[PDB]
Amino acid sequence: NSTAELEELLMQRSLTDPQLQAAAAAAADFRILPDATVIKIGGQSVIDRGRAAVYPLVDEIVAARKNHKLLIGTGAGTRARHLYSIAAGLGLPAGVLAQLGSSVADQNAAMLGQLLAKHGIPVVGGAGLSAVPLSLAEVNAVVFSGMPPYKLWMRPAAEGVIPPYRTDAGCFLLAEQFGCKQMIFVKDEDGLYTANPKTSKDATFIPRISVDEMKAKGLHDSILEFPVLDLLQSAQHVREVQVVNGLVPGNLTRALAGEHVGTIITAS
Amino acid sequence: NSTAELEELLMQRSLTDPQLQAAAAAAADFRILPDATVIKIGGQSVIDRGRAAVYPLVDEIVAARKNHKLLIGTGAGTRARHLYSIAAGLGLPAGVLAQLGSSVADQNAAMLGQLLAKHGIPVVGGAGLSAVPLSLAEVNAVVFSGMPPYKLWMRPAAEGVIPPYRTDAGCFLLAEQFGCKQMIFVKDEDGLYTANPKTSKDATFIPRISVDEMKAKGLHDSILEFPVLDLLQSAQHVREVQVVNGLVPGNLTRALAGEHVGTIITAS
Amino acid sequence: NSTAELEELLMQRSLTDPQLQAAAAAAADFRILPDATVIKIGGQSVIDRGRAAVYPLVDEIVAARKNHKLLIGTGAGTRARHLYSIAAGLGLPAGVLAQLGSSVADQNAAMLGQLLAKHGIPVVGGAGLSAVPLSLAEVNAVVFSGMPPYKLWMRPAAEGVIPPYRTDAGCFLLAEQFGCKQMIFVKDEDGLYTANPKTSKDATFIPRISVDEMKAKGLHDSILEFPVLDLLQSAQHVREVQVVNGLVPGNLTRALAGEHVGTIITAS
Amino acid sequence: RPIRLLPWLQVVKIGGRVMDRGADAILPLVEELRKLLPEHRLLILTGAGVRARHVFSVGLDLGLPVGSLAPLAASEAGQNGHILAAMLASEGVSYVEHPTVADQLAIHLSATRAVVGSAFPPYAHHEFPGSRIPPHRADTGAFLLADAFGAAGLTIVENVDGIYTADPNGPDRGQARFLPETSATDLAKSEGPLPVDRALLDVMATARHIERVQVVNGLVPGRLTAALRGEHVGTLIRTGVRPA
Amino acid sequence: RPIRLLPWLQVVKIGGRVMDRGADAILPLVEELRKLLPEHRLLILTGAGVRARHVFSVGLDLGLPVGSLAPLAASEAGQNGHILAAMLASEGVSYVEHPTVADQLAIHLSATRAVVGSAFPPYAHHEFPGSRIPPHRADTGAFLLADAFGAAGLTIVENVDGIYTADPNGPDRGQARFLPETSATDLAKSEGPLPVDRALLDVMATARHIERVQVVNGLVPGRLTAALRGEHVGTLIRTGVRPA
Amino acid sequence: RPIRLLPWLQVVKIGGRVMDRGADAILPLVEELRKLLPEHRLLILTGAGVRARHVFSVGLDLGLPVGSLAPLAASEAGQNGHILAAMLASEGVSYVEHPTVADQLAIHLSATRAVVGSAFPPYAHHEFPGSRIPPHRADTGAFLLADAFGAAGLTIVENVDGIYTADPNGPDRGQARFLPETSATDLAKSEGPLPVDRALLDVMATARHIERVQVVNGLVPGRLTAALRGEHVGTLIRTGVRPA
Ligand SMILES: Nc1ncnc2c1ncn2[C@@H]1O[C@H](COP(=O)(O)OP(=O)(O)OP(=O)(O)O)[C@@H](O)[C@H]1O
Ligand SMILES: Nc1ncnc2c1ncn2[C@@H]1O[C@H](COP(=O)(O)OP(=O)(O)OP(=O)(O)O)[C@@H](O)[C@H]1O
Ligand SMILES: Nc1ncnc2c1ncn2[C@@H]1O[C@H](COP(=O)(O)OP(=O)(O)OP(=O)(O)O)[C@@H](O)[C@H]1O
Ligand SMILES: Nc1ncnc2c1ncn2[C@@H]1O[C@H](COP(=O)(O)OP(=O)(O)OP(=O)(O)O)[C@@H](O)[C@H]1O
Ligand SMILES: Nc1ncnc2c1ncn2[C@@H]1O[C@H](COP(=O)(O)OP(=O)(O)OP(=O)(O)O)[C@@H](O)[C@H]1O
Ligand SMILES: Nc1ncnc2c1ncn2[C@@H]1O[C@H](COP(=O)(O)OP(=O)(O)OP(=O)(O)O)[C@@H](O)[C@H]1O
Ligand code: MOO
Ligand code: MOO
Ligand code: MOO
Ligand SMILES: [Mg+2]
Ligand SMILES: [Mg+2]
Ligand SMILES: [Mg+2]
Ligand SMILES: [Mo]
Ligand SMILES: [Mo]
Ligand SMILES: [Mo]
Ligand SMILES: [Mo]
Ligand SMILES: [Mo]
Ligand SMILES: [Mo]
Secondary structure, X not given: OOHHHHHHHHHHOOOOOHHHHHHHHOOXXXXXXXXXXXXXXXXXXXXXXXXXXXXXHHHHHXXXXXXXXXXXXXXXXXXXXXXXXXXXXOOOOHHHHHHHHHHHHHHHHHHHHHHHHHHOOOEOOOOOOOOHHHHHHXXXXXXXXXXXXXXXXXXXXXXXXXXXXXXXXXXXXXXHHOOOOEEEEEEOOOOEEOOOOOOOOOOOEEOEEEHHHHHHOOOOOOOOOHHHHHHHHHOOOOOEEEEEEOOOOOHHHHHHOOOOOOEEEEOO | OXXXXXXXXHHHOOOOOHHHHHHHXXXXXXXXXXXXEEEEEOOOOOHHHOHHHHHHHHHHHHHHOOOOEEEEEEOOOHHHHHHHHHHHHOOOOHHHHHHHHHHHHXXXXXXXXXXXXXXXXXXXXOOOOOOHHHHHHHHOEEEEEOOOOOHHHOOOOOXXXXXXXXXXXXXXXXXXXXXXXXXXXXXXXXXEEXXXXXXXXXXXEEOEEEHHHHHHXXXXXXXXXXXXXXXXXXXXXXXXXXXXXXXXXXXXXXXXXXXXXXXEEEOO | OOHHHHHHHHHHOOOXXXXXXXXXXXXXXXXXXXXXXXXXXXXXXXXXXXXXXXXXXXXXXXXXXXXXXXXXXXXXXXXXXXXXXXXXXXOOOHHHHHHHHHHHHHHHXXXXXXXXXXXXXXXXXXXXXXXXXXXXXXXXXXEEEOOOOOHHHXXXXXXXXXXXXXHHXXXXXXXXXXXXXXXXXXXXXXXXXXXXXXXXXXXXXXXXXXXXXXXXXXXXXXXXXXXHHHHHHHOOOOOEEEEXXXXXXXXXXXXXXXOOOOEEEEOO | OOOOOOOOEEEEEEOHHHHOOOHHXXXXXXXXXXXXXXXXXXXXXXXXXXXXHHHHHHHXXXXXXXXXXXXXXXXXXHXXXXXXXXXXXXXXXXXXXXXXXXXXXXXHHHXXXXXXXXOOOOOHHHOXXXXXXXXXXXXXXXXXXXXXXXXXXXXXXXXXXXXXXXXXXXXXXXXOOEEOEEEHHHHHHOOOOOOOOHXXXXXXXXXXXXXXXXXXXXXXXXXXXXXXXXXXXXXXXXXXXXXX | OOOOOOOOXXXXXXXXXXXXXXXXXXXXHHHHHHHHOOOOEEEEEEOOOHHHHHHHHXXXXXXXXXXXXXXXXXXXXXXXXXXXXXXXXXXXXXXXXXXXXXXXHHHHHHXXXXXXXXXXXXXXXXXXXXXXXXXOOHHHXXXXXXXXXXXXXXXXXXXXXXXXXXXXXXXXXXHOOEEOEEEHHHHHHOOOXXXXXXXXXXXXXXXXXXXXXXXXXXXXXXXXXXXXXXXXXXXEEEOOOOOO | OOOOOOXXXXXXXXXXXXXXXXXXXXXXXXXXXXXHOOOOEEEEEEOOOHHHHHHHHXXXXXXXXXXXXXXXXXXXXXXXXXXXXXXXXXXXXXXXXXXXXXXXHHHHHHHOOEXXXXXXXXXHHHOOOOOOOOOOOHHHHHHHHHHHHOOOEEEEEEOOOOEEOOOOOOOOHHHOOEEOEEEHHHHHHOOOOOOOOHHHHHHHHOOOOOOEEEEEEOOOOOHHHHHHOOOOOOEEEEOOOOOO
């Protein structure tokens, strides 16, 4: 490889050309925010539950940002499910539902951000940054809405009109594209089980699992949006994620401290 | 009361239902920026007067932000009165005049903000925040335009087309909705008098008065936009305001220090 | 002179009136960011060259912002020249090309900004500020796109459709209008020579020269956009500029330290 | 009095709770709106409905003030506007944002026969204190706009026939008598729930142009069409603007 | 030379000081504009007028540089555009922002017969130094746009009959002789006040399409209409673009 | 299946490398587009072309991830859209931004016969990882939009006749056989370069409306016109949506 060979391919071939694709893969790898952790605060699993769930997590965020740089993305939750149901019954496409769901994640970011405002932590928006570098350097944390920006360009699922890339995917992709050191999903269960613990009696807790093992166990679509597992296997920077129960006091703090609470899901 | 009883009312009744209204009134009360002070810098009374008035207040803002978190909103002044006169003579409605007046308050925020830029203090905009939490945490002050965002949805006065909610109301409502600890109006008189001190010989100074007492004295429409007095009586967080003379050196500094310069107007 | 005489002229005369123009010239002169240095990072001369040129300058920016407040504007480079060639061949006017060139300078600001993000340095945009005062106070540096905002209102050159005010002019005008203490153009040559050093064998290096001397030597259009030289002669605040070679390790650092590397071009 | 900016405009406010019924209510309404496009120049504004009650539930539980809840509710009205506009897209209808409604409505209604916007006004964090529930909601915003424009009318499309003396779906449904006609001042002097914002009655008191607002049942096809022709098929609210 | 983007466009710049006269001047102008809508495709651009002098007074007293004063003045021209557009709203006319004028004017003039924008160019903090008074003002911005578009004309609507040899309202009013026709180069070589920006003469020197600009008295009904038909009712400024 | 939002829409994607040829290619295409305006309602979307290869060269040299390169490339497609729209401005055509395409396309195509936008989708820093080259590019964005709208068709305007078995400009040009018709699934199972994004084939697999996409040579006047009438003048790609 060389810069000249890569630039020659880049000028003379289609971007679909395997030779170009392979030369581009040898490029150096810059991590934009390598010291930051992305955390997703679930909409249905946390913010929809109101004060009993949100206030302890606010306290943890405030305590954590002393020693940890945090990008805190919000899920959407039951109001997005309602919008999806109205729009799906009208026959509207996934690209229309994608924008409806984003508004709900924005509401949740605004609510969480207003509880954090007096600690200096802003809500930031965009399909990328602007306000992120300065806020991370000065107050060590920002809040963002977790939904991807695809809008009408959302890729539909194989079946149905529910957007397949929602706030798990949105937060994961940001962690991946910023080259963050860690991705923590904050939900309302201790982690992954062998079956849905809300609808099954004797599901067994899984501390650690690979994406391939999850698929073989029929857990492709369980505690994470299933497309996130495929994104994870393709990722360059974030090759494992941790799922923790934000309803347990101090669980986020302990996860940020390196404690293996919850489930660690690995790309391989 | 309970969360469940409130949520049941919220689902099953009109928001106009008195029972719902009463259950909502029992909700906890979060103050978003409880340590901040909102200050309004008058347009006609201060910024229109140019350097002799503005430069000493810039010095006070710079000295004050060491020990005080400040949200500094600007009034509009004579250019807004000119726009109101042109638009009123054309028969245009209050909602159109509201936007014209906002542009003037924006001009004043930009002028004041450029004198403060080298001290790190930004101009911020929006019908709310974004840039406020981070700026308050880092440089202890922000400048904003004081006009409310109602635009064409401005409620008209009972008579005439002048918008009744202008920059006194805009700044007050921000102080109230952020739950700030203090609201200081910076004008060009020492405070409230029993009559307009510019057009009356022997008006008497009033150090402290309630809104009800002001109305009984015929002072409903005097040193503050009269709708502000009604907003003040409805407020949850800011139940008194202080009016001070920004043309007196150090008056803002002393008001921020707890000195009773000027007039304190109380909701009750 | 007096404020009253100036305000009387301002009300009663055309702004074209020489008497008004002269009274306005006696106004006090406020510098908005007097301690800041504007630096332009060339598009063709630096950023287009990729890592070997950009990474050392990133290191210098990071080291410099400890003791220096920096506004770092980006040039455009070969992609803008390509857009100009397509649009000029279609007969499109300078005002259309101006917007095309700005997009390229924006791309370069985004690339540079992402290398600086982990050091807290943001990309900021607008025909002025917003994010500049806070970022300068907190992280001592910002990155901005260098193209002026004139869009379709770009003044055309006397001949041809290439916009005459591009990123040299954009950065210079910002330095001038903010009253910055210093303007450094970072290019790919040690400074000004008596002829183009890339196409001439024995050009002689010029450490210091005035704009008038440059014009007399036929160097009107050499290492800087020629309109910049006229802007420089009209400037109130930035009356000299320094051109340095950003490909020389530490050259920007040494220029910021007061070392006379490169060429100093003076208005008079 | 102020001039009428858009005297030929008809404003139609669609209740958020009508939208909440989904396709069963929205499809007939969309077909009725389609047939109205060649007859009127329409600004169609959507309310918020049940999702705003949920975000009020969460927001109040978190302690948030009324200036925080107002834009959270306005978001749901905006989402209803995007949904309804998508259904009329093939007729040339799009959702337009508040600044566009405020400043460019004339050119948009020149381009196409109707546009959809959010009925909530952008009071946002400058909402008035007093109640923990944002007072200036979809009915109030729609009326403020319609009256500011000097529009030919405002029709409020509800999930009930009009205003009753009691909530016809509430505990006292049995006592609820239909009011074919009322005045804003009479409604304001009553206590008890209404299907329209209480703040609607206050802005009607200061109105400059709109003399009457009809509340009609959007669940009955044809009532909106009849209402836009002035036929009396719901509750007429007299605003207290006097005719010439 | 560059192509003409909008060869069928007529650009009309309304002086800020015309707007400053209020209804007495604006109502006749609005009625004349109304009658012109079916005859021309109009971009109507407003200048700033006296309010920009006030903000210059305050800004200069505060020491602010010319890059700070320029957008403060442009704001007043924008406000004049919102006022004028509101008066023509019932004809389908709206104010459109600078980015929309710059990039989407064609679709907006397809939707409706005229739009209103701010005549000031967005030089903002990149205004040129030299004078403490922003040089690129409403006349200059309107001409830059009109010439960039290759428009069929630019008409400048003033509060005086045209250009005189002296300010016809100034100390030397008695010596002021009307100039029915002049060239930009002749005007540029004179010292003394003009009713048009001095920078207008400079951008006329580099113009690519517009051959003449007429300054007409908007206080005389019918002069704008006659000017848009090429009739000579004010001062013609020859730009020094040569005809084919 | 989902409803068709804009069933009467024709979407035309112009290759960035067609635009890169400059006036020699763009002027005939502009004249052909002009003649098509009265026949179809057009959303014209531009790809990126060679400038995106240059910014990929710089960005990859700087180490930047694929979420950083995606919006850098999308910028070039946007610039191509501004250029093409400027050429059609006198016909009422303007460039419109992504949020406007997403939410207000219906009103804009009511105002005028065609608009231009960027074919890239706004995946920006949420582009998928895997390749260092952004996968969701101009073909993919144009198809996502066209299928989401339920448009009557998507035509891809290339600098070659269609899809061949090898790059007809590459090292193996001699083996390159023209494919008059193919299916997305057959193309996806091949390795080797294509003139369309590989991601285009993936979104075709989940498509809901568009049954076929033709790739035609925009360098041959008349092929776009014939393609928009369903005539077979390039490579037809069957998406695997089945007809009724
Ligand atoms: N095998 C499993 N193990 C653990 N949880 C599971 C499993 N299968 C399904 N779940 C469910 O997944 C849920 C977490 O996903 P959910 O979408 O509720 O979270 P969220 O991030 O809050 O969503 P949003 O943010 O979109 O509202 C759990 O509440 C749990 O009931
Ligand atoms: N009883 C009173 N006591 C004191 N001042 C009064 C009284 N009645 C009227 N005023 C007038 O109110 C003025 C303050 O209100 P004014 O609107 O000028 O201030 P402002 O906040 O600068 O306005 P804006 O910001 O809208 O320009 C004083 O200058 C004073 O002349
Ligand atoms: N007399 C001269 N002395 C030095 N350099 C000269 C001279 N005349 C011409 N040049 C050329 O000017 C170039 C610097 O201008 P150039 O436009 O390349 O820089 P830039 O700021 O990177 O441009 P952009 O940012 O617009 O891409 C040098 O690379 C050099 O070849
Ligand atoms: N006096 C009354 N007359 C008629 N309906 C009433 C009355 N009081 C309460 N209601 C209730 O109001 C309901 C309508 O609720 P609401 O007005 O909140 O919905 P909406 O107008 O669709 O919502 P939004 O204000 O968000 O647009 C009716 O179905 C009815 O049950
Ligand atoms: N040589 C001149 N000929 C004619 N009028 C002149 C001349 N010199 C000065 N003037 C003055 O210019 C005045 C017009 O002022 P000006 O041009 O500033 O207003 P405007 O064009 O309405 O404002 P704006 O530039 O903000 O749109 C005339 O009324 C006249 O008094
Ligand atoms: N199998 C193939 N069949 C046809 N052309 C191919 C094939 N493989 C590679 N190509 C090349 O693809 C070129 C078109 O390049 P590309 O598709 O990148 O341009 P574009 O579509 O104009 O750009 P953009 O995707 O930015 O709009 C053709 O000229 C041809 O050389
Ligand atoms: O929102 Mo629009 O449709 O031209 O301004
Ligand atoms: O500003 Mo607009 O873009 O009327 O459709
Ligand atoms: O972008 Mo626009 O919304 O032409 O009316
Ligand atoms: Mg209702
Ligand atoms: Mg003039
Ligand atoms: Mg291609
Ligand atoms: Mo907008
Ligand atoms: Mo906008
Ligand atoms: Mo805009
Ligand atoms: Mo915009
Ligand atoms: Mo936009
Ligand atoms: Mo927008």
